[PDB]
Amino acid sequence: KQIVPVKSVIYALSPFQQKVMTGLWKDLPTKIHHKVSENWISATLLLGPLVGTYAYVQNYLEKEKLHHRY
Template structure:
């Protein structure tokens, strides 16, 4: 099969003078807009990407305390009901 040449047309798009007046509002204060948006992105990413060490530590402490309490209760150092606690005082 042979190659056949294709006829291509070039299309150029341009804005009319009325549309160009509207476009100037987009470029107005561009550095300030960029700074404003990057500042909020930086704050948001810092808040959501930072770890929460307190929740991790409290979970570890909770597990340690559970194991200690389980050891205490397995030795028979606990009271079976509230009345026995009150009578011993």
């Protein structure tokens, strides 16, 4: 567990010489663009099986209900 020095040169600024909470909502539309563009595959994979299974279950339940309802 050692440190590996890199030979960099780092300029830093005081936390009291720069605004804090503006960067949250700065450049918001591009942020939302990224969040949606680079992740729609993941959301599709997470939710698609769930909604598909729910639709299948409801279809089966209703069809059995009608068939057995005399």
